[PDB]
């Protein structure tokens, strides 16, 4: 299928209307970030030749 970017939302804009929240949600979301790799070393002579 041709992908849909998102669901339609025509915001009800006008020159004298404002939307003020009457409640709220405390949202907890995760972010995963890699920090380090495995520290590897090579004995170049031993690897190439044994």
């Amino acid at each position: 299928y041709t992908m849909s970017l998102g669901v339609e939302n025509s915001v009800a804009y006008s020159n004298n209307s404002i939307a003020i929240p009457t409640n709220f949600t405390i949202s907890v979301t995760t972010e995963i970030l890699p920090v380090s790799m495995t520290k590897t070393s090579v004995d170049c002579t031993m690897y190439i030749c044994g």
């Binding site: 070393s41 004995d43 031993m46 044994g50």
Partner: protein, 50 residues
């Protein structure tokens, strides 16, 4: 099959036709002795970076 390693007894059970053994990295780790039908685990000699 020639190389260097430390030979110890192994609890792996070879099938009777098999002679050599390889790990995930396709390196030899066990060989069956031609004289006595026993399986010797070959771990590499303990190298390290000084």
């Amino acid at each position: 099959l020639t190389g260097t390693g430390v030979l110890t007894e192994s609890n792996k059970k070879f099938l009777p036709f098999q002679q050599f053994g390889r790990d995930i990295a396709d390196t030899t780790d066990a060989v069956r002795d031609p004289q006595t039908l026993e399986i010797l685990d070959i771990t590499p000699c303990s190298f390290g970076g000084v």
